[PDB]
Amino acid sequence: AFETTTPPEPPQFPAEGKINYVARDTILEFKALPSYSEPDWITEKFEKAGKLPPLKERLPEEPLVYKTGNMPDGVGVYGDTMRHVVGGRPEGWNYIAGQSQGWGGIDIALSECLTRTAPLFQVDAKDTEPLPNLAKSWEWSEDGHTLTMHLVKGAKWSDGEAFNADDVMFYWEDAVVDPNVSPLGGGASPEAFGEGTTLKKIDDYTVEWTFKAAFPKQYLYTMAYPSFCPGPSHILKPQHPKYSKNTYNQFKNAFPPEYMNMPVMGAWVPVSYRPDDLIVLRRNPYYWKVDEKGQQLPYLNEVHYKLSTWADRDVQAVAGSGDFSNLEQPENFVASLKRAADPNAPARLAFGPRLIGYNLQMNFSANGWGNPDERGQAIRELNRNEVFRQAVTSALDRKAIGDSLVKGPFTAIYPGGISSGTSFYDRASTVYYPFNLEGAKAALASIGLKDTDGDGFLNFPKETLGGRNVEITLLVNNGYATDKSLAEGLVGQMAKLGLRVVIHSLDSNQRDAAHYGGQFDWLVRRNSTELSSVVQNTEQLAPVGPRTSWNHRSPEGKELDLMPFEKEMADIVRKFISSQDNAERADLMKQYQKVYTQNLYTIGLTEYPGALIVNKRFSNVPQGTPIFMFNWAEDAIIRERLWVAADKQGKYELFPQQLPGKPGEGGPINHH
Ligand SMILES: OC[C@H]1O[C@H](OC[C@H]2O[C@H](O)[C@H](O)[C@@H](O)[C@@H]2O)[C@H](O)[C@@H](O)[C@H]1O
Ligand SMILES: [Mg+2]
Ligand code: NA
Ligand code: NA
Ligand code: NA
Ligand code: NA
Ligand code: NA
Ligand code: NA
């Protein structure tokens, strides 16, 4: 009944900061170097005092080596602190059991994964193999069902314990396969790695994947952050219910934020924590990454995470008291641009492509996900009705939504689906339902929704819930002004259509528990990587598995009650995952976009670009780094490779010349 078209082209964005494209193998390689070096105080005060082993003995025989050619400013010098500001709060250190550490780069820096993809924003080539990280190399069998994966060899956790296949296997078996454990982020279900996929240990430094499909190369991306970031099994395994008398809740909570020096494969280790104030990390002396001159990374000795608000991160970065921000809330754009416009500004600000998007997601489970009551169930039935979805999207004045956030060329009309800023995007394949409130009102009337009590809100027919008013709950992340503003705008627009929408505003952790547990009717959410990049966590594009979709999961352990268009989307996604043909992949994403946007798998709210803000004293920041593409800029900028020239260094270290203490002990260790 609606006059659909394609979305109008947004205003031209002079998108400052162009990316310097490079080839995949210009960034790093694994190899032995003839000599290695580290900060002088480690050698003088720890090694020479017999308190820490010599550096060569702490490194793998073949460490990960960053190639100087890809370094924007070349080889670094030691020193200084990276000062981050975050809106989140740590629950504890058990990432693989689903605890948040506060976001804003903390878990990104702690939890290293098998592969790495965030720095791939600088590779234009199709289609790029994820960078090796904890997995140094891999080989496909001739038939394409077997993937032999070789691990970094001789690397150690920050506490000196060997990193090997046991850590990989513990994550796979006891975190992924185990249905009672859910790693942080809402993903990492077994089917995210392919239906029926198995993983086995060959030896201490070799694992073997077996896939049902032939060459499903897209799963290498799933082996990067957030889905395959192994934890220290020697510490975690004795707390797991399979190997102790602990319950799953006791395993999840065994490492509270106060527990210091949690072993990591990351560049820095947590050494201090003050509630609602600060987390301090110190350099990991067992870090397994070096530069081409043999200097053990990171260059920065310390990292701070000030516990504040997300809006304060922007404020502190432009003021110069914070060193980094992802300017991603349009309500903060004008004030930030004003401060950045001063030539004496301590920080540089640079917008990227339009990769920040928001969708309204409707719960499509009519078979019990989140155990809904009679009211909840009737909403799942409306959600699954295509005429209802068409009315909701048509009742949205998308120009007004964008203007409510910020004026100017930032926002773009966003019907939903793949972001307009990504290479797989096809405007002609994007179904746009223009603002048509009258048509939206007539469509709801056609499915039996009419105002029978004179209050302007539509009622169910007499047969459903005694003909009461339709009432829909809207789950919102209370940590962001943008999410709240979009939710408030959504309530207003729905009231004009005649639907009563009630906001359920929760902090990040509670919001995640309600979302992943399926305890929602509708929710407002900022897009994740599958919509900004397609290639990162591709399984999230459709219900390919019982728990891969953000808005259609099945209760444990029922099958999905998929609608025909969702089955079509799932088939396209599985075909894309196993394709190495560039023309076929591009065509499949055109088909995917059309099915998504025609059927309204989700309903787009708005889309706009974000800007990376970084203190000017840092060297090695890549030009044109986007705030979000394969992952957040905290990962993409490669913080372990950043450095500050000696004459520009800040004097901000809270534990200078100190190293992390033992897991569960007081805090850091000194030389005297
Ligand atoms: O982790 C870095 C990130 O932190 C904040 O975003 C948190 C959200 O992003 C995750 O990908 C996750 O899927 C969500 O649950 C989580 O809320 C911040 O807004 C970002 O700029 C960035 O620093
Ligand atoms: Mg071990
Ligand atoms: Na074979
Ligand atoms: Na194990
Ligand atoms: Na298995
Ligand atoms: Na239990
Ligand atoms: Na806290
Ligand atoms: Na993927």
Side-chain angles (χ1 to χ4, degrees), residues 1-452 454-672:
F2 300 95
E3 247 196 59
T4 65
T5 187
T6 56
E9 268 166 72
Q12 270 282 351
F13 207 85
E16 228 53 39
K18 263 70 134 283
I19 296 155
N20 292 130
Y21 295 103
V22 297
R24 186 252 197 190
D25 294 317
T26 63
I27 304 164
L28 57 93
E29 67 181 314
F30 288 85
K31 60 160 177 158
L33 294 173
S35 175
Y36 303 102
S37 61
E38 66 195 337
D40 287 308
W41 59 268
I42 291 173
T43 318
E44 234 64 19
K45 291 157 182 275
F46 290 83
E47 191 232 295
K48 283 205 254 186
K51 307 298 176 197
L52 191 72
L55 175 59
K56 201 186 205 82
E57 301 165 24
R58 283 143 47 212
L59 289 169
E61 168 63 30
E62 296 188 307
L64 186 156
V65 180
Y66 277 106
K67 302 173 137 291
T68 314
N70 191 56
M71 289 186 181
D73 294 297
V75 156
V77 294
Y78 290 114
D80 219 328
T81 310
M82 164 91 279
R83 308 163 301 170
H84 286 293
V85 178
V86 309
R89 298 289 187 273
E91 284 176 297
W93 309 103
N94 200 340
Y95 180 100
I96 68 150
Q99 285 193 314
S100 175
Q101 285 77 57
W103 305 111
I106 324 169
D107 58 291
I108 285 168
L110 295 170
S111 291
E112 293 265 348
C113 323
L114 295 180
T115 67
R116 193 179 187 164
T117 64
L120 301 178
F121 71 92
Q122 63 206 301
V123 181
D124 203 347
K126 52 188 197 290
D127 237 296
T128 312
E129 206 167 19
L131 302 166
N133 196 57
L134 293 158
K136 69 180 299 299
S137 72
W138 50 88
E139 293 116 50
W140 289 93
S141 60
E142 217 89 288
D143 64 17
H145 296 296
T146 303
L147 179 66
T148 304
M149 186 158 276
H150 302 274
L151 308 176
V152 57
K153 186 172 173 186
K156 289 146 198 98
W157 289 90
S158 55
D159 66 352
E161 192 93 338
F163 172 77
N164 62 35
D166 296 333
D167 297 303
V168 172
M169 296 317 297
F170 178 73
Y171 177 70
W172 179 255
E173 301 169 341
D174 298 316
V176 176
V177 173
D178 194 324
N180 295 299
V181 181
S182 291
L184 184 70
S189 68
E191 302 85 4
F193 299 89
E195 177 46 68
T197 292
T198 68
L199 181 61
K200 73 179 196 191
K201 184 188 168 165
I202 295 301
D203 59 42
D204 296 317
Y205 297 95
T206 318
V207 299
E208 181 189 282
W209 297 86
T210 299
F211 301 100
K212 176 186 171 180
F215 303 102
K217 299 194 182 177
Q218 216 63 53
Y219 294 136
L220 281 154
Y221 279 82
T222 319
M223 295 171 208
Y225 177 95
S227 308
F228 207 117
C229 316
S233 63
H234 56 288
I235 299 300
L236 295 176
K237 192 169 177 184
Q239 302 303 326
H240 191 283
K242 236 109 107 228
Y243 316 98
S244 72
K245 292 225 160 191
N246 276 359
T247 63
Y248 278 93
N249 190 251
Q250 286 177 303
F251 168 58
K252 184 177 177 181
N253 290 285
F255 304 94
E258 298 80 9
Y259 183 102
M260 291 295 99
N261 311 310
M262 187 72 178
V264 298
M265 290 311 294
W268 310 269
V269 188
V271 303
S272 179
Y273 163 72
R274 184 182 298 141
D276 297 304
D277 172 30
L278 183 69
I279 302 163
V280 177
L281 316 188
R282 279 299 287 185
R283 65 181 306 108
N284 169 6
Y286 294 90
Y287 202 50
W288 49 280
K289 298 181 200 187
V290 302
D291 62 24
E292 274 192 307
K293 298 284 201 74
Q295 302 184 297
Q296 183 192 37
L297 304 176
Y299 294 120
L300 300 167
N301 295 142
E302 193 166 310
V303 177
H304 299 169
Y305 297 91
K306 287 203 164 204
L307 310 175
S308 189
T309 69
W310 296 113
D312 194 41
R313 181 180 61 186
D314 301 329
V315 173
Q316 291 207 227
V318 302
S321 56
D323 292 326
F324 176 102
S325 186
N326 296 320
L327 179 60
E328 62 196 2
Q329 297 187 243
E331 300 97 315
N332 300 159
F333 288 3
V334 180
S336 299
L337 279 161
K338 173 205 174 179
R339 246 96 192 173
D342 191 323
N344 218 59
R348 171 145 20 261
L349 185 153
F351 278 92
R354 292 191 186 86
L355 294 167
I356 307 304
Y358 277 82
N359 278 276
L360 158 61
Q361 297 193 352
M362 299 178 164
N363 192 328
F364 292 152
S365 165
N367 65 348
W369 182 42
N371 188 39
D373 60 8
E374 208 189 351
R375 187 212 57 83
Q377 187 68 24
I379 307 304
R380 305 289 175 85
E381 293 181 0
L382 279 171
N383 286 349
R384 293 167 66 88
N385 183 310
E386 67 180 26
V387 176
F388 179 80
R389 299 197 298 283
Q390 285 170 11
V392 171
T393 195
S394 297
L396 302 181
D397 177 354
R398 282 172 169 87
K399 191 198 176 283
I401 297 176
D403 286 353
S404 80
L405 296 186
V406 74
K407 292 195 176 87
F410 303 96
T411 68
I413 297 299
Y414 176 61
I418 293 166
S419 158
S420 71
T422 193
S423 60
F424 279 116
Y425 176 79
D426 187 63
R427 191 161 302 273
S429 297
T430 307
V431 181
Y432 173 46
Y433 284 82
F435 179 53
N436 183 1
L437 184 64
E438 291 319 303
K441 282 177 187 167
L444 292 186
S446 81
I447 60 166
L449 301 185
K450 61 176 196 162
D451 178 21
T452 59
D455 67 356
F457 292 97
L458 304 166
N459 289 256
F460 283 112
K462 212 63 80 188
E463 53 244 57
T464 316
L465 292 161
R468 73 207 220 197
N469 273 339
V470 177
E471 173 189 325
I472 300 152
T473 66
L474 181 67
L475 174 64
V476 187
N477 190 320
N478 83 354
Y480 301 87
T482 308
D483 294 58
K484 286 166 149 165
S485 178
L486 291 167
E488 283 172 40
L490 191 43
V491 173
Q493 297 223 66
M494 292 300 97
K496 288 174 192 162
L497 178 54
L499 293 174
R500 189 206 172 201
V501 178
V502 180
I503 296 164
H504 185 200
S505 206
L506 297 174
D507 41 58
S508 185
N509 306 318
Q510 275 144 251
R511 186 232 72 88
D512 283 358
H515 181 175
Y516 313 147
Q519 295 167 306
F520 71 96
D521 293 352
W522 289 7
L523 62 84
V524 166
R525 192 181 149 269
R526 189 172 58 197
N527 290 347
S528 46
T529 62
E530 76 283 0
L531 298 181
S532 57
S533 76
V534 175
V535 292
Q536 179 63 239
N537 289 285
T538 309
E539 82 281 349
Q540 289 164 6
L541 289 171
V544 290
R547 294 175 302 275
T548 64
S549 168
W550 296 117
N551 63 314
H552 196 173
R553 302 190 177 186
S554 67
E556 179 180 323
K558 287 208 194 177
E559 322 273 344
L560 285 157
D561 57 321
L562 298 189
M563 290 178 283
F565 82 91
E566 297 180 289
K567 301 183 290 178
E568 299 312 336
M569 287 174 70
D571 287 347
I572 292 159
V573 175
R574 281 183 291 255
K575 196 172 172 193
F576 178 93
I577 286 169
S578 284
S579 175
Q580 284 79 239
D581 189 275
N582 294 322
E584 189 195 6
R585 283 164 63 87
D587 256 289
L588 284 164
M589 283 303 112
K590 287 184 185 189
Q591 293 168 238
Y592 173 85
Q593 186 73 155
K594 195 99 203 155
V595 178
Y596 189 125
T597 62
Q598 180 178 310
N599 297 282
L600 306 146
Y601 179 65
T602 74
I603 294 165
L605 299 173
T606 195
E607 159 203 84
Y608 52 86
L612 178 60
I613 305 170
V614 185
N615 196 88
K616 287 177 178 168
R617 80 186 189 277
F618 291 94
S619 290
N620 266 359
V621 178
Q623 199 181 87
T625 301
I627 63 157
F628 184 73
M629 191 184 278
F630 294 84
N631 197 11
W632 292 100
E634 289 93 331
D635 191 345
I637 68 175
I638 312 173
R639 288 179 287 167
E640 66 266 32
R641 204 180 61 166
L642 299 181
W643 56 271
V644 185
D647 57 15
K648 287 189 176 179
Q649 284 184 12
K651 293 174 181 81
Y652 310 127
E653 291 166 289
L654 287 167
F655 300 100
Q657 305 189 322
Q658 292 193 237
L659 290 174
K662 290 173 194 291
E665 287 189 26
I669 56 153
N670 50 71
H671 62 271
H672 245 266

